[PDB]
Amino acid sequence: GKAFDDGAFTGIREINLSYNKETAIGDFQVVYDLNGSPYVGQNHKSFITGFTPVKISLDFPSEYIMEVSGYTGNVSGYVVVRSLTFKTNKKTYGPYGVTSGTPFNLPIENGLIVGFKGSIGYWLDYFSMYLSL
Amino acid sequence: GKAFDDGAFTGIREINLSYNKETAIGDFQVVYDLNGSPYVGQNHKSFITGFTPVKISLDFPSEYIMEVSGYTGNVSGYVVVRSLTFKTNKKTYGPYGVTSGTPFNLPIENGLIVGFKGSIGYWLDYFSMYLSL
Amino acid sequence: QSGISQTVIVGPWGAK
Amino acid sequence: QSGISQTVIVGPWGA
Numbered sequence: 117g118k119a120f121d122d123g124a125f126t127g128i129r130e131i132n133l134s135y136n137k138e139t140a141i142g143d144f145q146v147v148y149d150l151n152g153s154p155y156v157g158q159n160h161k162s163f164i165t166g167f168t169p170v171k172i173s174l175d176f177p178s179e180y181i182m183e184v185s186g187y188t189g190n191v192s193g194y195v196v197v198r199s200l201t202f203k204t205n206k207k208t209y210g211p212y213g214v215t216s217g218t219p220f221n222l223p224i225e226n227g228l229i230v231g232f233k234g235s236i237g238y239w240l241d242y243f244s245m246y247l248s249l
Numbered sequence: 250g251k252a253f254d255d256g257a258f259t260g261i262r263e264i265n266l267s268y269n270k271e272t273a274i275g276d277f278q279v280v281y282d283l284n285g286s287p288y289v290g291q292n293h294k295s296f297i298t299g300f301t302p303v304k305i306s307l308d309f310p311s312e313y314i315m316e317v318s319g320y321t322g323n324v325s326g327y328v329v330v331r332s333l334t335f336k337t338n339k340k341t342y343g344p345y346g347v348t349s350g351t352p353f354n355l356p357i358e359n360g361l362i363v364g365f366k367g368s369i370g371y372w373l374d375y376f377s378m379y380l381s382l
Numbered sequence: 383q384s385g386i387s388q389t390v391i392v393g394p395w396g397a398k
Numbered sequence: 399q400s401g402i403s404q405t406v407i408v409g410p411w412g413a
């Protein structure tokens with residue numbers, strides 16, 4: 117897959133992703149907050165197409181992500197993130213994509229996701245998160 | 250369980266925990282660094298005995314934890330931390346306990362675990378970790 | 383704010 | 399040091 121790294125920003129305003137329930141999470145793009153103004157992140161796109169796009173539009177600044185969880189599993193020989201769920205103080209968005217395989221979750225007791233990095237080939241291979249106060 | 254919250258420190262020097270190879274994690278205790286001095290954190294003790302103690306003595310400050318992982322699951326009907334594994338830049342300590350149930354993992358690409366909080370009754374019920382640069 | 387300094391905390395894992 | 403600010407990073411998940 118093609119590695120990406122957004123670096124760190126002030127907060128998150130919108131998450132844009134795509135998935136296919138038969139396979140895994142496909143594209144990923146975040147609209148960040150940068151010093152109280154929207155910053156449109158790079159769109160990190162799969163090698164292939166056919167996915168279902170979703171827009172998660174957060175009521176920033178009062179709504180923020182409290183937990184990112186998911187499943188990883190093998191799709192056509194590739195171990196990829198097959199499912200994502202984003203839980204905010206206001207609501208849960210997801211699961212998007214097939215909820216079978218090995219679960220992961222990052223719950224946050226204090227602090228803010230402020231950036232994403234990872235890798236996307238045919239599917240989202242993996243991702244990490246920047247956290248700040 | 251009985252709640253505990255050590256708070257945040259400069260680093261970790263040593264983890265003293267106990268486990269049963271048939272059940273879950275019991276006692277948990279941490280010697281932190283506090284600005285260059287060992288800080289003996291309070292021994293957080295299971296309400297029950299029968300555990301096998303483990304002393305994870307890190308080569309602070311050159312050695313530091315890069316991933317904490319484990320399993321949560323039912324024991325006697327309670328969800329508890331059944332297993333913990335501490336991987337550092339030098340070597341892997343664990344798994345300790347029973348490697349069964351829902352897996353979890355917090356890998357750290359950048360930054361440091363500087364504190365623990367949680368709750369222990371018969372077993373370690375749950376926990377969280379303070380992170381810092 | 384207060385005079386208490388803050389730190390990122392991730393978790394909890396385990397009983398909810 | 400360098401002139402680049404740093405930030406805690408957790409991950410990755412997926413493998």
Ligand SMILES: CO[C@@H]1O[C@H](CO)[C@H](O)[C@H](O[C@@H]2O[C@H](CO)[C@H](O)[C@H](O)[C@H]2O)[C@H]1O
Nearest residue numbers: 250251327328329369370371372373374397
């Ligand atoms: C038998 O004693 C129990 O030990 C358990 C496993 O360590 C729990 O600590 C239990 O305390 C109960 O824990 C549950 C969590 O699933 C919940 O907090 C409940 O409110 C609490 O009494 C303890 O009695």
